[PDB]
Amino acid sequence: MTKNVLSIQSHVVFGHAGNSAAVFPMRRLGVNVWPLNTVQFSNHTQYGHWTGGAIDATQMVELVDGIGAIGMLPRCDAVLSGYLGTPEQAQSVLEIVKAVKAANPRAWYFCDPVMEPGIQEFLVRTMPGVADAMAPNHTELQRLVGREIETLEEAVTACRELIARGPKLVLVKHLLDRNSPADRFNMLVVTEREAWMGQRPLYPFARQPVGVGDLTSAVFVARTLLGDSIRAAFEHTLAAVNAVVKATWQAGRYELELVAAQSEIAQPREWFDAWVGD
């Protein structure tokens, strides 16, 4: 039996961002994905211009109503959200998660709190109470606890403070460590009982590829649904992101080499061992 994730993110026709970065890696790992596209744009916004449009917040919920009407919502094992442009879209995600958990009480919500008036406020004040897992980057974690974080102890303490508000797991998808060499890319994952740090090479780019955070959350969600332990899912995520970003760097590209490097999403060749962060 194949697991199912409802992924509620942006769609771009060209390139990779949002669902265009997240759906294929999760499928390639062996998990089904129901992509609810909150927008359809020609390309991601870091090119500086794009065409297309967003669906409205009520239409998001209506799509999930349709899935419910054909009897499929109990099959949803997880909900994943990432960048949302408006608080109205975030409210629809809340409504959708409630509907999914009513149909399947075992379902969990993985909120990647990517940070219009009200959207930072929504992610900080409201989403922790409904998310089973959150995946902030370093600056998003600082906003979630309302203070600066520069040590590993401060990072773990902050994650545990956020966990006390509801989430059972915090994935710091990029951790800044003032004591770490500048050519290393650090990550951290924390639960009530566990804390794991990990590190991969940082590849240099003139402009940062879009979608690395979306890929990170997607691989972690898929490996978790496939039954990995916290540490195993974390290490596979670190290694898979390493493989894709390395391949992007090696080819001198800007858009992630997701299709070209797909074998190493599923079976990364270069592995990085996590270490105890507590």
Add this chain to the structure above:
Amino acid sequence: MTKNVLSIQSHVVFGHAGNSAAVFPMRRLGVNVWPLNTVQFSNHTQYGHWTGGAIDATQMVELVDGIGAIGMLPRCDAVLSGYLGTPEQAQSVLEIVKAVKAANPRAWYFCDPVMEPGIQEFLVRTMPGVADAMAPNHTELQRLVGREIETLEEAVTACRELIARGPKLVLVKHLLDRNSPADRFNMLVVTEREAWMGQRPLYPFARQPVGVGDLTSAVFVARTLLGDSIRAAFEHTLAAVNAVVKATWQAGRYELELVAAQSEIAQPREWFDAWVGD
């Protein structure tokens, strides 16, 4: 260098149809896909009810304008279309193909002519003049030449008549052969110089899975872009569709087992040799 296909088809959030059937298999085979979603529905229409909506025809072209504005249209190696609900959407596909070929004269258009007033007429009267390849099923082929087809000779003759109008290749994605056993599923591919017949087992279903034709066209497009000969692309398509439909049948499912059977999209275990159809 990875090839790129612009795939202009429906999107369904749950299940597989249109781009939800076509995008993942092409990516899994090693080709990039730019999905231009003509609609976003909750699920495919053979459940009998759905929610969601279509984008308008002008918005389709505007998405491609955006890709052109960031300089990417010369990278498009093929355009793929399948089911279109309105002649206005079909006209937008025509406009898009013209723009793509202006940016890249080597690009080709693969029209799966899935058959509102005017859409059969458009596919029969207008699309042959612009499509480099068409993938009708048996009844669509009969409509394209305006007569009944029951022998293999009649099928090859009909394909060659259609080729004389413009297309260089006709993939009959399901060929009805009155002389073939009822538990066989036949296909045919014809060019000016070649004709290949092939056959796989027909798996019995209470209701036919949606997306088999979309999967067929997608695998054939991807294998062609990867450099396969006509016969090689045809055989890989036959074997990959066999693998997915067999896995769907074996699990007693209705929606195609695309993710579960993905290894056999790329490397089918059971192979069927084509034979000369001329």
